[PDB]
Design an enzyme around this catalytic site. Structure first.
Site, mmCIF file in Angstrom:
data_model
loop_
_atom_site.group_PDB
_atom_site.id
_atom_site.type_symbol
_atom_site.label_atom_id
_atom_site.label_comp_id
_atom_site.label_asym_id
_atom_site.label_seq_id
_atom_site.Cartn_x
_atom_site.Cartn_y
_atom_site.Cartn_z
ATOM 1 N N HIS A 165 27.457 44.093 38.721
ATOM 2 C CA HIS A 165 28.466 44.481 39.729
ATOM 3 C C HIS A 165 29.301 45.614 39.145
ATOM 4 O O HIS A 165 30.290 45.351 38.438
ATOM 5 C CB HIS A 165 29.373 43.291 40.105
ATOM 6 C CG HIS A 165 30.341 43.582 41.218
ATOM 7 N ND1 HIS A 165 30.360 42.865 42.402
ATOM 8 C CD2 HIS A 165 31.308 44.525 41.333
ATOM 9 C CE1 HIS A 165 31.312 43.349 43.182
ATOM 10 N NE2 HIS A 165 31.896 44.357 42.557
ATOM 11 N N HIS A 198 30.233 50.222 40.019
ATOM 12 C CA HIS A 198 30.210 51.296 41.012
ATOM 13 C C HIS A 198 30.262 52.604 40.257
ATOM 14 O O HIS A 198 30.973 52.720 39.225
ATOM 15 C CB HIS A 198 31.444 51.241 41.955
ATOM 16 C CG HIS A 198 31.673 49.914 42.614
ATOM 17 N ND1 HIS A 198 31.181 49.603 43.862
ATOM 18 C CD2 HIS A 198 32.347 48.814 42.198
ATOM 19 C CE1 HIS A 198 31.535 48.376 44.192
ATOM 20 N NE2 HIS A 198 32.232 47.862 43.190
ATOM 21 N N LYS A 205 25.015 43.747 49.371
ATOM 22 C CA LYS A 205 26.421 43.355 49.135
ATOM 23 C C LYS A 205 27.126 43.025 50.420
ATOM 24 O O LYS A 205 27.013 43.748 51.400
ATOM 25 C CB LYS A 205 27.132 44.529 48.424
ATOM 26 C CG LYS A 205 28.664 44.459 48.377
ATOM 27 C CD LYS A 205 29.210 43.440 47.387
ATOM 28 C CE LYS A 205 30.716 43.580 47.293
ATOM 29 N NZ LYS A 205 31.067 44.758 46.505
ATOM 30 N N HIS A 212 31.591 39.895 47.544
ATOM 31 C CA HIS A 212 33.019 40.043 47.251
ATOM 32 C C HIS A 212 33.670 38.782 47.829
ATOM 33 O O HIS A 212 33.336 38.373 48.934
ATOM 34 C CB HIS A 212 33.605 41.277 47.979
ATOM 35 C CG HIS A 212 35.111 41.376 47.914
ATOM 36 N ND1 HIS A 212 35.777 42.318 47.136
ATOM 37 C CD2 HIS A 212 36.079 40.656 48.537
ATOM 38 C CE1 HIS A 212 37.080 42.144 47.261
ATOM 39 N NE2 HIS A 212 37.292 41.158 48.120
ATOM 40 N N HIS A 216 33.463 38.125 42.046
ATOM 41 C CA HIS A 216 34.910 38.061 41.732
ATOM 42 C C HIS A 216 35.396 36.647 41.433
ATOM 43 O O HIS A 216 36.556 36.305 41.652
ATOM 44 C CB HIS A 216 35.770 38.736 42.822
ATOM 45 C CG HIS A 216 35.325 40.124 43.168
ATOM 46 N ND1 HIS A 216 34.669 40.951 42.269
ATOM 47 C CD2 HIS A 216 35.437 40.833 44.319
ATOM 48 C CE1 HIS A 216 34.409 42.109 42.854
ATOM 49 N NE2 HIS A 216 34.845 42.057 44.101
ATOM 50 N N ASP A 234 38.435 35.578 39.317
ATOM 51 C CA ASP A 234 39.782 35.703 39.882
ATOM 52 C C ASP A 234 40.445 34.347 40.063
ATOM 53 O O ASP A 234 41.642 34.273 40.287
ATOM 54 C CB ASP A 234 39.784 36.457 41.211
ATOM 55 C CG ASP A 234 39.570 37.939 41.027
ATOM 56 O OD1 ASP A 234 39.487 38.381 39.866
ATOM 57 O OD2 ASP A 234 39.502 38.666 42.034
ATOM 58 N N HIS A 242 35.050 40.503 36.976
ATOM 59 C CA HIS A 242 36.324 41.168 36.843
ATOM 60 C C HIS A 242 36.953 41.046 35.457
ATOM 61 O O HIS A 242 38.163 41.232 35.319
ATOM 62 C CB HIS A 242 37.312 40.640 37.880
ATOM 63 C CG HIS A 242 37.261 41.369 39.183
ATOM 64 N ND1 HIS A 242 37.928 40.929 40.305
ATOM 65 C CD2 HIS A 242 36.585 42.483 39.558
ATOM 66 C CE1 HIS A 242 37.707 41.767 41.303
ATOM 67 N NE2 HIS A 242 36.888 42.712 40.880
ATOM 68 N N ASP A 271 32.956 45.341 37.070
ATOM 69 C CA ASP A 271 33.392 45.908 38.352
ATOM 70 C C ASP A 271 34.113 47.233 38.109
ATOM 71 O O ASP A 271 35.173 47.500 38.691
ATOM 72 C CB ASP A 271 34.299 44.925 39.111
ATOM 73 C CG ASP A 271 34.403 45.244 40.596
ATOM 74 O OD1 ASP A 271 33.641 46.109 41.096
ATOM 75 O OD2 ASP A 271 35.255 44.625 41.267
HETATM 76 C C1 LIG Z 1 34.420 48.029 46.111
HETATM 77 AS AS1 LIG Z 1 35.615 46.753 45.216
HETATM 78 C C2 LIG Z 1 37.353 47.653 45.091
HETATM 79 O O1 LIG Z 1 35.887 45.332 46.186
HETATM 80 O O2 LIG Z 1 35.048 46.350 43.618
HETATM 81 CO CO LIG Z 2 34.941 43.528 45.577
HETATM 82 CO CO LIG Z 3 33.104 45.998 43.190
#
Ligand SMILES: C[As](C)(=O)[O-]
Ligand SMILES: [Co+2]
Ligand SMILES: [Co+2]
Ligand SMILES: C[As](C)(=O)[O-]
Ligand SMILES: [Co+2]
Ligand SMILES: [Co+2]
EC number: 3.1.8.1
Lengths: 330, 331
Positions: free
Chosen positions: A22, A24, A136, A168, A197, A200, A221, A268
């Protein structure tokens, strides 16, 4: 499922190697990077920066990253292919929808959306021929009606292609539970799904209960922390105040409860970020100068030191990703 | 301003000719046409359909259209350039933001938005060098806080470049009054501004007041009549029951009150429409098969029949658009 599609073409499962699942290159919005590249300095500056970061992650042992930017995160697969070739790092591209779909997506039926994701997986993104290797999706609390359609279509596309689904969540609201119900209502196997995530939350029971059902748990994260910057509200709102060590110990917790095979770890991270406050990237890069190398440089050593065997670390960072990404039909 | 920017380059004011001031090639969303062209059959099929339509409008006397598709209406400026060249009709492209801005837009300051609008006007859209000749903005009722920034940035961009601004309104809510207030607070002259979809209201005095203040009044929904279509709720919801004749008669009312100089007329037509229910286009094309030719083929003859003189009709369809589009800095 003996081949993974990357932005440079298919690779064998063993070529994937150490994989971040995960990440970007850039988090933006559909059309935004091509309409206003100066927001990132220039497209060239962004690409050069991405290549620097990918080269450093490669130096640290990363062989593959999964870019989970959807259409509405402003995914630019031509940029991905460019930086993947320049940095020599495999990048798996994504289809799906995140939580900023425009009207022309929002108004679509489950059937239409299924055809869109299939297009991106089977035939290629835009006119490039570059095929997605993952889907995703997202909720931020209880799913909106459109979000239910997105998850159902993601389930349908995964069943037809074998490509995994990754999510997400707002973990604090246990999104993974509703997400799992919806996916299971479509007959999707939990082993095709990563609930992301998930670090979190500190609600370990929420996490082990999902892993017990066969879901992969995305602890993606780890470096996200606003500690030392609690007076920067936008950063704390984004990053949280929980330390990276706390987040990493969830990995150990899951391992200790027997769920090492269900764990996927990531940063992330990203090299541009337009869908938040201006200059947020500067804040994030000060918070984690290692960027995508944070997992191999800080997290894996920390776990090993806390007594996680090398073997378990290799399973989490190489084996689980290979199993997850290998296209697998029911 | 001696030149108007089009998707094929600058034209002289007199080359503009008969001009439709609120139209679209395709109403979509940012990135959508390139990611999912099969939604429209194909990009090729969409282009071919737009060319046929543009060619019939050209046959009826249309020389120029203003495509008021913004970034978030999924404006594909390469597509505009392609169909402009193939149909041989001038097309003016737009900058601005309509009411579906993505996060990366919604989060920007007035200063940033101003810079983005200026980029598309002065330097070029994307990497194409094609420069916008108009700024399109939108409210749908009381402006949201983001829409206020958009309107202020549009006004700053217009003041700096001379390019006009044109608006989407919810006319029934008198949007034009707040839009005007905002533009004036930035010192923009009303003659730079067209308050659009204004034929959606029956309140003539709301219209005449704006015209008196110097605003252009955009009567661009003439063919949007959901007449005999209550069987279709999203179509009659899209369109309305007010007849096209009733809407055209608002043009005559403004003329009769002395505001022929403040009137801009168009069809608000389009060849693809992804930002609505699926197959809405079939419904729209069955309602108005003349398409963009509806203005020159139906409306102009109807107005003449109602006693509107030829010179007045030339003024509205040629002279007003030329004045509007010709880049004009304040004093
Ligand atoms: C595309 As994102 C800010 O939910 O890692
Ligand atoms: Co996300
Ligand atoms: Co992301
Ligand atoms: C882009 As429209 C539907 O307001 O003419
Ligand atoms: Co409109
Ligand atoms: Co319009």
């Amino acid at each position: 499922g003996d081949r993974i599609n990357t932005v440079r073409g298919p690779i064998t499962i063993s070529e994937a190697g150490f994989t971040l699942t995960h990440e970007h290159i850039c988090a933006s919005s559909a059309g935004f990077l091509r309409a206003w590249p100066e927001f990132f300095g220039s497209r060239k500056a962004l690409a050069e920066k991405a290549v620097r970061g990918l080269r450093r992650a490669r130096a640290a042992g990363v062989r593959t990253i999964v870019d989970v930017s959807t259409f509405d995160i402003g995914r630019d697969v031509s940029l991905l292919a460019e930086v993947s070739r320049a940095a020599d790092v495999h990048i798996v591209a994504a289809t799906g929808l995140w939580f900023d779909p425009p009207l022309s997506m929002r108004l679509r039926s489950v059937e239409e959306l299924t055809q869109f994701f299939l297009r991106e997986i089977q035939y290629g993104i835009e006119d490039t021929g570059i095929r997605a290797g993952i889907i995703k999706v997202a909720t931020t609390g209880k799913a909106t009606p459109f979000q239910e359609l997105v998850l159902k279509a993601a389930a349908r596309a995964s069943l037809a292609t074998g490509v995994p689904v990754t999510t997400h969540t707002a973990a604090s609201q246990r999104d993974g539970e509703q997400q799992a119900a919806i996916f299971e209502s479509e007959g999707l196997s939990p082993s095709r799904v990563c609930i992301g995530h998930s670090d979190d939350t500190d609600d370990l029971s929420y996490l082990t209960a999902l892993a017990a059902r066969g879901y992969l748990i995305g602890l993606d994260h780890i470096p996200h922390s606003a500690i030392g910057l609690e007076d920067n509200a936008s950063a704390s709102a984004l990053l949280g105040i929980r330390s990276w060590q706390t987040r990493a110990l969830l990995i150990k917790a899951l391992i200790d409860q027997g769920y090492m095979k269900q764990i996927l770890v990531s940063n992330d991270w990203l090299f541009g970020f337009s869908s938040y406050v201006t200059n947020i990237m500067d804040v994030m890069d000060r918070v984690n100068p290692d960027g995508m190398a944070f997992i191999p440089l800080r997290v894996i050593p920390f776990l090993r030191e806390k007594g996680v065997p090398q073997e378990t670390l290799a399973g989490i960072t190489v084996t689980n990703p290979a199993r997850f990404l290998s296209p697998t039909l029911r």
